[PDB]
Design an enzyme around this catalytic site. Sequence first.
Site, PDB file in Angstrom:
ATOM      1  N   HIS A  19       0.805  -1.216   0.000  1.00 39.78           N
ATOM      2  CA  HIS A  19       0.000   0.000   0.000  1.00 39.78           C
ATOM      3  C   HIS A  19       0.843   1.274   0.000  1.00 39.78           C
ATOM      4  O   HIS A  19       2.072   1.221  -0.090  1.00 39.78           O
ATOM      5  CB  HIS A  19      -0.963  -0.009   1.195  1.00 39.78           C
ATOM      6  N   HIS A  22       3.767   1.434   2.510  1.00 39.10           N
ATOM      7  CA  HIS A  22       4.926   0.649   2.116  1.00 39.10           C
ATOM      8  C   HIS A  22       5.693   1.406   1.038  1.00 39.10           C
ATOM      9  O   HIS A  22       6.923   1.507   1.084  1.00 39.10           O
ATOM     10  CB  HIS A  22       4.507  -0.705   1.545  1.00 39.10           C
ATOM     11  N   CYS A 127      -7.498 -16.068  22.432  1.00 37.90           N
ATOM     12  CA  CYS A 127      -8.541 -16.485  21.503  1.00 37.90           C
ATOM     13  C   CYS A 127      -8.089 -17.842  20.985  1.00 37.90           C
ATOM     14  O   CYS A 127      -7.092 -17.932  20.269  1.00 37.90           O
ATOM     15  CB  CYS A 127      -8.683 -15.527  20.322  1.00 37.90           C
ATOM     16  N   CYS A 130      -7.837 -18.014  17.103  1.00 40.50           N
ATOM     17  CA  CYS A 130      -6.661 -17.366  16.520  1.00 40.50           C
ATOM     18  C   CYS A 130      -5.400 -18.070  17.005  1.00 40.50           C
ATOM     19  O   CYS A 130      -4.368 -18.070  16.330  1.00 40.50           O
ATOM     20  CB  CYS A 130      -6.567 -15.904  16.955  1.00 40.50           C
ATOM     21  N   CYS A 144     -12.518 -10.614  20.131  1.00 41.30           N
ATOM     22  CA  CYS A 144     -11.376 -10.854  19.262  1.00 41.30           C
ATOM     23  C   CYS A 144     -11.529  -9.989  18.017  1.00 41.30           C
ATOM     24  O   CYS A 144     -12.560 -10.027  17.345  1.00 41.30           O
ATOM     25  CB  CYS A 144     -11.307 -12.325  18.845  1.00 41.30           C
ATOM     26  N   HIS A 147     -12.292 -12.787  15.144  1.00 46.81           N
ATOM     27  CA  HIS A 147     -13.511 -13.592  15.193  1.00 46.81           C
ATOM     28  C   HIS A 147     -14.725 -12.912  15.817  1.00 46.81           C
ATOM     29  O   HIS A 147     -15.829 -13.449  15.768  1.00 46.81           O
ATOM     30  CB  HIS A 147     -13.239 -14.908  15.924  1.00 46.81           C
ATOM     31  N   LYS A 297      -7.149   8.930   8.688  1.00 44.96           N
ATOM     32  CA  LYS A 297      -6.386   7.721   8.407  1.00 44.96           C
ATOM     33  C   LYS A 297      -7.086   6.903   7.326  1.00 44.96           C
ATOM     34  O   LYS A 297      -8.317   6.862   7.262  1.00 44.96           O
ATOM     35  CB  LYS A 297      -6.234   6.884   9.680  1.00 44.96           C
ATOM     36  N   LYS A 300     -10.535   1.065   4.217  1.00 42.42           N
ATOM     37  CA  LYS A 300     -11.618   0.717   3.307  1.00 42.42           C
ATOM     38  C   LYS A 300     -12.893   1.207   3.974  1.00 42.42           C
ATOM     39  O   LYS A 300     -13.804   1.720   3.321  1.00 42.42           O
ATOM     40  CB  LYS A 300     -11.663  -0.804   3.107  1.00 42.42           C
TER      41      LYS A 300
HETATM   42 ZN    ZN Z   1      -9.675 -14.873  17.221  1.00 44.09          ZN
END
Ligand code: ZN
Length: 500
Positions: A19, A22, A127, A130, A144, A147, A297, A300
Amino acid sequence: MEKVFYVTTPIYYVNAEPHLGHAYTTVVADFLARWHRLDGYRTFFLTGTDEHGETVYRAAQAAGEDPKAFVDRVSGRFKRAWDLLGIAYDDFIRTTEERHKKVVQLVLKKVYEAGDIYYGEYEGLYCVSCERFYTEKELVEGLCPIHGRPVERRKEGNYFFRMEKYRPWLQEYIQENPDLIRPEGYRNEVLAMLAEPIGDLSISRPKSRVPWGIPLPWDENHVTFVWFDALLNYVSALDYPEGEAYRTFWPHAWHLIGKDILKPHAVFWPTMLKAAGIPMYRHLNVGGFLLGPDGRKMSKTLGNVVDPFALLEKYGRDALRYYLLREIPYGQDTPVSEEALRTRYEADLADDLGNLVQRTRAMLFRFAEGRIPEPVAGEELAEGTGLAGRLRPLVRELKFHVALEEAMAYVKALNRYINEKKPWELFKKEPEEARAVLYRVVEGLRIASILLTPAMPDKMAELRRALGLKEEVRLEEAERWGLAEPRPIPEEAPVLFPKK
Ligand SMILES: [Zn+2]
């Protein structure tokens, strides 16, 4: 008195979508590297990808690909991005490389033998989906961030690095080295961090949990913490400890980063180096956020994301590079937009520089037999030879925008000189004076083109060719007047900065 320059950029998550952030950081590093090479420095410019950790591993699994094969493929995305942006890096380090594995294990062994490692229990919110811990701040209102489900408190055995042991030293080191962290605002931020305990750092997790990475040399059942692993790319790329590259470049290490990874570079990294008996880096150069057109900032979510490759495709690599270096002061949050890139392009490149080059060629064909006239003193324009000396410190102090501004101001002066002297009028009764004026502008352009080369490599080389000047240049050539030789210019030359 050996001139050496070493600059690094952060190695990025290998499967990340390249992006604007970078792009900016890398373009800035490239400007620095190109500038120093142009100024005769033995230079090393490093970039790369972080290819370890469970996130990468799970991405590969989700993609239905073997992990090594996965990273081998997706890493090409960043290599592609750097090619598109015209980044002349010396090495692209991938953390899956054997030399990296060996350095990380050697450094871990050193820290271990220094007695800075101990086995302990890591406890916190977890989590199970994860398979990682999350601080209350990382959570999205107790859920999380991935999730969107509740987390649970779990414990795990990890090996820890006695980071706190080096806080007093680090605090004092930064205090006695004012320019280590720049800009100054970030230094203060780090000092605030070091004012309070920084604690110990977990440097590993069980392979059962994180199976993708570098195993601890004393316990193959554990994998090295991603940050410890990644940070060492800065010395592994130099083949520490026996590589001559390490001996040559490490003493001059400049690290470029975005403020989002400040703690790891200003706190973790220095303590790791000290514990491993490796000299501190010379400078940590912290950039700000490139905000969306709305000043907020990019996300999307907000719909204010500016795509660097979309910009690069439409206006060209050099136009984009120039815009970012000219309008974004390194270190401070600054909004960007296609509208700003277009205006900067039309005003500075298409108008001020490009059209001047076009009109100069036209006048050379008309009043100088399509050749660069015989060299004459520079008069008012001779001061252009002093710009390099003025720009060196600006570049070293991360004031790229000021440097470009000064170079372009000279370009503007060349334009006014033309309109002021009017060679087309001088030619009527004094053609020699008309040709002398044209020589001064050509020589001025030669000088200006050299100063701008690090920002727009290809376009400045093209400008040189359009005027029949020596394409390959050195910064020192911009400090002497009268180097442009009386030679014919190409019969035709494409438009340097075409209208978009
Ligand atoms: Zn998670």
